[PDB]
Amino acid sequence: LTTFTFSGLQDAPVAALSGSIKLNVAAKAGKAEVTVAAGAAKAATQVSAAALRKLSGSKISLAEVARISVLHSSIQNYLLS
Amino acid sequence: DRVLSLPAVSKNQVLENVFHTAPKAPVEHLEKMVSANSKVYDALNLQSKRVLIWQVKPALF
């Protein structure tokens, strides 16, 4: 993706969508009060506005590790299906 | 001609017109289908050693 992105703590999801994990943000103008709740272990922190903008400074850039290639694995998945 | 009073169809012809086909064993189904479902197990289990999930939906690391 691009070198400068403009998302974070503004029109963010205010709640989770399924009951498998519970997530609430109590966002003020400056920071946010997030408590992520997943089953046995639940965690809570205060995520800054300058942290969700600093997150896309480095990119993950996911890539598939395949046995031969990704093209071959797509053809083999079609043969299997 | 006492031989013409005997039944003309031999005992060999009775044994080959009665036991005509070799019968199917009951264990053949178990042996054949277990040898094939071993390949169904090995390819498609997620706990099989040579599973085909990482060759088909490769990964995303």
Experimental technique of record: cryo-EM
Element (H, E) at A71: helix A70-80
CA distances from B3 to A62, B7, B8, B10 (A): 92, 8, 8, 12
* Interface touch B56/A73, C-beta < 8 Å: yes
Model resolution, angstroms? 3.0
Which of helix, strand or coil describes residue A44? strand
Which of helix, strand or coil describes residue A78? helix
How far A71 CA lies from chain B's nearest CA (Å)? Answer: 10
B60 touches chain A (CB under 8 A): yes
* Interface touch B61/A65, C-beta < 8 Å: yes
| Cα–Cα distance, B7 to B61 (Å, whole number) | 83
Distance of CA A72 to the CA centre of its chain: 29
| Cα–Cα distance, A73 to A45 (Å, whole number) | 41
**Which three-class secondary structure string do you get for B16-39?**
HHHCCCCCCCCHHHHHHHHHHHHH
